[PDB]
Amino acid sequence: TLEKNLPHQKAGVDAVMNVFVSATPHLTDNVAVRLLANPELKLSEQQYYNNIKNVQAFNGIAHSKDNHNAKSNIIDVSMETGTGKTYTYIKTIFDLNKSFGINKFIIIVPTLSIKAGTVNFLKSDALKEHFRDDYKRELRTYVVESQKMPQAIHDFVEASNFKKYIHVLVINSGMINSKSLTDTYDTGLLDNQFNTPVDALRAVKPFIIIDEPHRFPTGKKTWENIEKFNAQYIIRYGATFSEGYKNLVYRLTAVDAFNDDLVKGIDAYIEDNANLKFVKDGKEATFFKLAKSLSKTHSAIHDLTLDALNTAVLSNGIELKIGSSINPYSYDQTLADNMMRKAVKEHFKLEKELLTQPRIKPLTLFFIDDLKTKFEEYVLAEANELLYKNYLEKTVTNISSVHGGYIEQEINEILHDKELLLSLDNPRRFIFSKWTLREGWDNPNVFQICKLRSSKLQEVGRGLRLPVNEYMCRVKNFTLKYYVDFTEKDFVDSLVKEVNESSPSKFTQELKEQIDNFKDSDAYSRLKSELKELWDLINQKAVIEYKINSESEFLSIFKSFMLEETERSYREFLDNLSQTIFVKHGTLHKVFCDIKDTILNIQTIRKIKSGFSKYLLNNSFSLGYNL
Amino acid sequence: ANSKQLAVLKANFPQCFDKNGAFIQEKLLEIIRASEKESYSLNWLGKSYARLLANLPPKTLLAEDKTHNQQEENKNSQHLLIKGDNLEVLKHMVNAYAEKVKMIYIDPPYNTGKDGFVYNDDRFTPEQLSELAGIDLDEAKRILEFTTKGSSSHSAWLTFIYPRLYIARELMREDGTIFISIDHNEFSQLKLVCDEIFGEQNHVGDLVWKNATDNNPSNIAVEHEYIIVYTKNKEQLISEWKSNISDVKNLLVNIGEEFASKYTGNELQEKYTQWFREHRSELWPLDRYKYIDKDGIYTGSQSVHNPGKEGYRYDIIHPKTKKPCKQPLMGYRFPLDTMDRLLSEEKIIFGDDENKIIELKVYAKDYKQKLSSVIHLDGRVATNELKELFPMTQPFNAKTIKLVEDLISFACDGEGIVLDFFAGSGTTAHTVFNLNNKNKTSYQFITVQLDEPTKKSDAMKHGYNTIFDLTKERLIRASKKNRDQGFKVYQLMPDFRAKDESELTFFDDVVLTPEQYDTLLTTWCLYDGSLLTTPIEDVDLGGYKAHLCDGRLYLIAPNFTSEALKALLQKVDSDKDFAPNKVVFYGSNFSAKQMELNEALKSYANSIELDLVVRN
Amino acid sequence: KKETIFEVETANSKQLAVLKANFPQCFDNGAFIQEKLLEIIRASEVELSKESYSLNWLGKSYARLLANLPPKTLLAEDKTHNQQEENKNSQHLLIKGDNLEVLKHMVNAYAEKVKMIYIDPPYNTGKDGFVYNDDRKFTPEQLSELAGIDLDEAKRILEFTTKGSSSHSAWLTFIYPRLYIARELMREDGTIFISIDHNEFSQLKLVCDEIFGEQNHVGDLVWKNATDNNPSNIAVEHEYIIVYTKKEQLISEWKSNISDVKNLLVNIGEEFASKYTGNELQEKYTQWFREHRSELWPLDRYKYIDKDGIYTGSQSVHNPGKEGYRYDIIHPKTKKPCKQPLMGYRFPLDTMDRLLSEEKIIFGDDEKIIELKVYAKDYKQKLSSVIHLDGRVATNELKELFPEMTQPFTNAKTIKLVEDLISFACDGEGIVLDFFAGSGTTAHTVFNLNNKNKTSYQFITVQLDEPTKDKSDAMKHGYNTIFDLTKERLIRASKKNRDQGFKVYQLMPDFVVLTPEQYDTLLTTWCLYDGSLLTTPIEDVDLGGYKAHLCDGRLYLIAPNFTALKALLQKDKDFAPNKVVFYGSNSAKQMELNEALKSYANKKELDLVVRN
DNA sequence: AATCATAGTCTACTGCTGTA
DNA sequence: ATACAGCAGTAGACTATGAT
Ligand SMILES: Nc1ncnc2c1ncn2[C@@H]1O[C@H](COP(=O)(O)O)[C@@H](O)[C@H]1O
Ligand SMILES: [Ca+2]
Ligand SMILES: [Mn+2]
Ligand SMILES: [Mn+2]
């Protein structure tokens, strides 16, 4: 279920859309290329300068030298982790398509996990249904994949404009940097002109989106390759701009996210010295030097051995250069067993709280590096003690020991099992994931992250999102419990500083811690006419009813408003209008036929909505039916 | 003298004459021109037309065969049969069936030159085509010269399949596959167009179906055709295709255990060598599974050697002679590390001394049947299958059910949607009935068939006026045998809600016919992304008749009241099985009530936020 | 009268010439007239095709140019080899060098003479080392005019040809001019068989249509040649053989007449017309069969007889690897149900009853599984499009000739395949050309057919002196090129087949006095160029000095210091030269020769040419 | 700074089957 | 028959190199 419409999201959509006021879409003379390439969206330097200044002013962004640049087609959007930046850039793609008919976009991602997560979301039925209702558009997705002439590129370049389809190329950094894109082929694309993938993509005149712009440093290779596309405009989205801004259009910070409770609060748990450095294979211990691959002891460090030497590579994937250390007390059996036991006890305290309420299915995520029978024991014990859906859920948890479960293929399997994990039909709630797979977790119902054999904002962000109820809908104030080592004591102080530093000021004292109107009053009076008697009236629900006995009668009410507001395809206009106001296609057409005006744009539709709503309030017959 | 001139043209310019000895005027003209971009491509006149045809939107609606679907057998059926143009039918499936199909099997018209294939469609003026396709007026004139008139060339054939294969690709799951039957007429041309639509990297392989026995005098005796196989994504495609329930394998495990229960020591092998010596000839490909013990029948796998090149050289010690065993000519295929593991596992068969190369103990129960590229299966059995369904003579060159049965078993593994958009006689659908009633098997079939009239012929003389009628009947009969599995019928309908683009009384709609109302609900549910198998439940909202389907609620009927709205909010509050997230209503039958529905869907509590959509 | 071999050509030069020469009506002072050619087509009752399709590739116009280009090499003899007792009287040829250049030299003497072609071209798998390589060095400006394409298009093509590429366009640019020439060498009834795999089957088919025309497509064979047990989706176990012809002139049917034992059994089947009743016909035949049994290989299991001839029993009744049709068969004598096959029957009940009517079913003495009657008269009765022949025997054939080498050649074709194709397509006569020799399988097959089957074929095989892979079996044994290995294979295969031998020829670089080798090179080149077969003897003539040569009534005077001129005038018999070719680099003595020969040509004509 | 990606080479192996 | 060596074999692990 896609959340519409979140104010912090709609604000970012509008902030990119406002940059293109008075922009003109210029079609090519070439009849063949017109069907495959994008229209050239041209607008003057002054126009573009003025459009940005007005956006910055409205959004409360300082019109400084570091925040704007009229000699740059790069537009910037800043949104913190767990605020829906992906949904926002996708909704903007649909808006640039609605207003200008831009139908070909390149989504540039820096990682395979972000590529897998972006594609999953783009292909999902809930997204498809959401955007087909609101725009009467279909998105065709072309994913550039390493084969272990790229088909995604051929198909994206070759795809026809002829009108319900938006075409989108999803590509990662590794593929942008591959020779596969620079090479010459026997095959020609774009009216048989280009034998190179980059020349074929450049000719499409694309609009490029950059996900996490801090992973594309402007002076470096990846960015220089993106420059080769001679893109119309580049829209960068992220929480980190380590090289500053180009044209900052929107900023939703980490303090705003935590403060306006758009994200879960944090409840940190610190579970309670030595260092084994890699010398030259000789390893120095400070709590004596040992030689060398076999199991590392050297202490009690459980379950860890050397795999490669030159740098030394450990059994969990930890690569040590000559000088790199590791605290051997991190791998202690008692310390983990303790961390795991504590998270289980805290989960059931939250489980009986959420599953006895509509119900919310909570999840606990454990992060392993590479004892296991204990977990079951602990769950079983806490279940038999705590003995009504959670009574039957505990009964199934006792009757079975499948309450727990466990690189590009592995992330895909996580994303696949997503709807399954949130289903109250299956008992699985505890998840064991290797640290290397962390990038593939962003599950709203994860209420506990437990780093077992271990930016703080990035790691908490995996469980920051607002959870969904049994009816798969976001709850309309929860907290994520985070479990850390004895090694991390400054955790809440270092995270509270990190959130503040990233962002007159804030941040909430409670969030991250250790565990016109006169018309409205007349209407409220119309319905109205210890536990107190006033409580019984203030809690009795009713439903609005409009007393208009004829469509011919309604027609005259909308006509009056239309004439009073004289100071301001046609088919696509009326369809978009009906869906917003809501009034009959025939009655809107009838008034417009009578009226001495002439249509047709999104600005006109937005004025009729805002205007007619006010008119409706200011005037008068209406009611309230007892519901 | 005129024939002598023609012979010079054929002798020096053979490519200028088609397969039927007809003159290709343009091929000689392009030779005559030596004036001043060359690229790797299969090009044909109509490629731009085929590209248009695939992007052109549906001009129709979909509706059920209410009589057929309400029958007990067909009721909750997972199987579909659709009437209409397959291209139009596939375009309606996109919102619900992309990408959900595990396998596509199609038997398109071959371009035999004796099958009556001719390109023809519904659809333009040279002015009209030139604008939409985005090509010069001379090309739009040249295309229409063939699309409107009778054409059976490679280009006409490619214009016909391209949009069908293009849309079908969209319905395919990433791990999904397409299978296409053809003969020598269009094999290369289809294979080249599949390279275009799917990518050459996604070619799985081609199968050779040796299906005929031709004893009539000729140069080459043509006794085969092909099955081209492609995947949507070669990367997401399962690495291996194997059957674990072979008929030969199952027989041997049964015979193995039967002998094992009746005989003990050295007698077990003597009794087995007796039955083996006599039956060996029927055991292929397990005709060398001569050995037996208490764990079953096994073979000595003489599969330790290295293919083609130099391998691993080391000593394998004989357990009795204690000398190194004879080494294969190319050395071993296993590294010592793997060999040592096979020795500890007791997988090695040694000779009576070291002068014998080692073997691997492999049991018949562990046999997995692969898909060999050359299939020998007489196609003439399709007449026997059809005389058993229709005991009338000759109703349809139909495919036998014994061919697609194995391909469905390999591609799919007991589960998945099987799609045939050139149904023919209904062979694929029938094959799903036979496969399902041996299970762990529950595939769902979707087959499409055009309402093309029956020729005078046997079908016409029996009351079957269209190929669809014979197809529907064949599935009814095939369902009756095969335990009444049933299937649902759907058909394309004219778009009654359409109007010519105008603006001045334009929106002044006719009251919906009870049939029209049902056509809308069916089309809307599919368009909205719900599978044709998902049920549409009737909902009562204070007397008002609504419909619920996959989280979305439909309000088509007029006269929706304030009581209906209160009952809707009550049903959300009270009923545990009532959880909609989207409300769709018919505009023409709804402004004051239209606004009332919106305000109520925001003001009221539950705790679900319901979206409100307007349609027509 | 004055010629310098070998003249500039383009991608349509020869094509555009044939049209003007044969249709002057259709050419205006100016370009072509479409209406005039269209008028000639409509007149001969020829319809206008609606066909409009093509496979375009990068290097198409380049390939078209190389097809038209004249040779850029000379031809020599390997006289050391061709003077050996066994090889001197031979009619078989083995040529060293690039096939395209060898085929271009052959055009003049062999045009419309080849009865059959078999070739095993590179399959272009991702591991056969195939790349496009030319040994041509055109300027982009030269290609632009010759092609004719623009300078940028011309630059793109040379970048591609030197890259070198393994693509479909690379492979097509390579194959096109080789098949284009080979087609000119083939008789009107002549056939081409081409081995290929999945990699280039579609591309091969379409380029053969562009070269021969689709109407001249005979068909395609599948050679199911191996077993593959590697875990995959499809277990690929076959290969292809695309067959074309030069079709209106082709024999209606192909039948193999290689088996004397079949003909014997056909004769003996009929012969036994004297005996009619049974078991009396089976009494008289069994008696004869018990004696002659071993003289019947491979038809020696054909122990039974009936009114229609001699036959064997077939265990092909059961369904292989799969459960079949279950029904009962009642024994005609014991009147009990017959023993059912473990996997049921291959064919339905209705089929079984029809075979039981035609008495094509063999029962035991008991109610023993049934068998099918397979007749000797039917034995190799047709060329089935699916051939089941395990190509592993190529290793056996080669291990026999080369017992010292573990693996002589990488992926060699079996004699058994080539043997079969020749026997159906041909009738014991004609040239059999293989311009992609490799192991030398085609040549070897011709040695075998003429030896055992008493056929009169001539083989012409071409192989490039492509180096042997470093450290390989051939390299270890001293074989520097593939050609040195091919030559040796043919040498050892000749010794095993009654020493029929073969002649060797090799391509030479082109080019202030001559060396003796260079003198032998021009002589060999000129005789072929003039239309004489490489098997036609070049008689040495001594006109006082001299030293002249005569080949098919054409006299050659390459040698310098030609005086002696009166010795040629005196012939006396058998000497009758209608053409005089003499090396131009070896004026008045030349003007006197043309003057004297004109006076000697009455009565009655002897021409003159001054070459290079 | 410590992984994460891509492309390409080449290790490590398939299991039935022709012929002697 | 028993047995060696056949398979214009295949899939995927591992390496170099280079990105952030
Ligand atoms: N509004 C949203 N609701 C639910 N999921 C979302 C929303 N916005 C983003 N996502 C998901 O969170 C993931 C964030 O990945 P990323 O592309 O790095 O920003 C996306 O792949 C989406 O699957
Ligand atoms: Ca093969
Ligand atoms: Mn293309
Ligand atoms: Mn044909």
Numbering used by the authors:
A (entry chain C): 6 to 153, 163 to 176, 178 to 287, 293 to 300, 302 to 308, 319 to 323, 326 to 343, 346 to 392, ...
B (entry chain A): 13 to 48, 53 to 139, 141 to 408, 410 to 414, 416 to 474, 476 to 524, 530 to 615, 617 to 632, ...
C (entry chain B): 2 to 7, 9 to 30, 32 to 249, 251 to 371, 373 to 516, 535 to 586, 589 to 596, 600 to 614, ...
What does the publication say?
EcoP15I is a prototype of the Type III R–M family and consists of two methylation (Mod) and one (or two) restriction (Res) subunits, resulting in a Mod2Res1 or Mod2Res2 complex. The Mod subunits are responsible for DNA recognition and methylation, while the Res subunits are responsible for ATP hydrolysis and cleavage. Cleavage only occurs if the two recognition sites (CAGCAG) are in an inverted-repeat orientation, arranged either as ‘head-to-head' or ‘tail-to-tail'1112. EcoP15I hydrolyses ∼30 ATP molecules in two steps (a fast consumption of ∼10 ATP molecules followed by a slower consumption of ∼20 ATP molecules), which switches the enzyme into a distinct structural state that can diffuse on DNA over long distances.
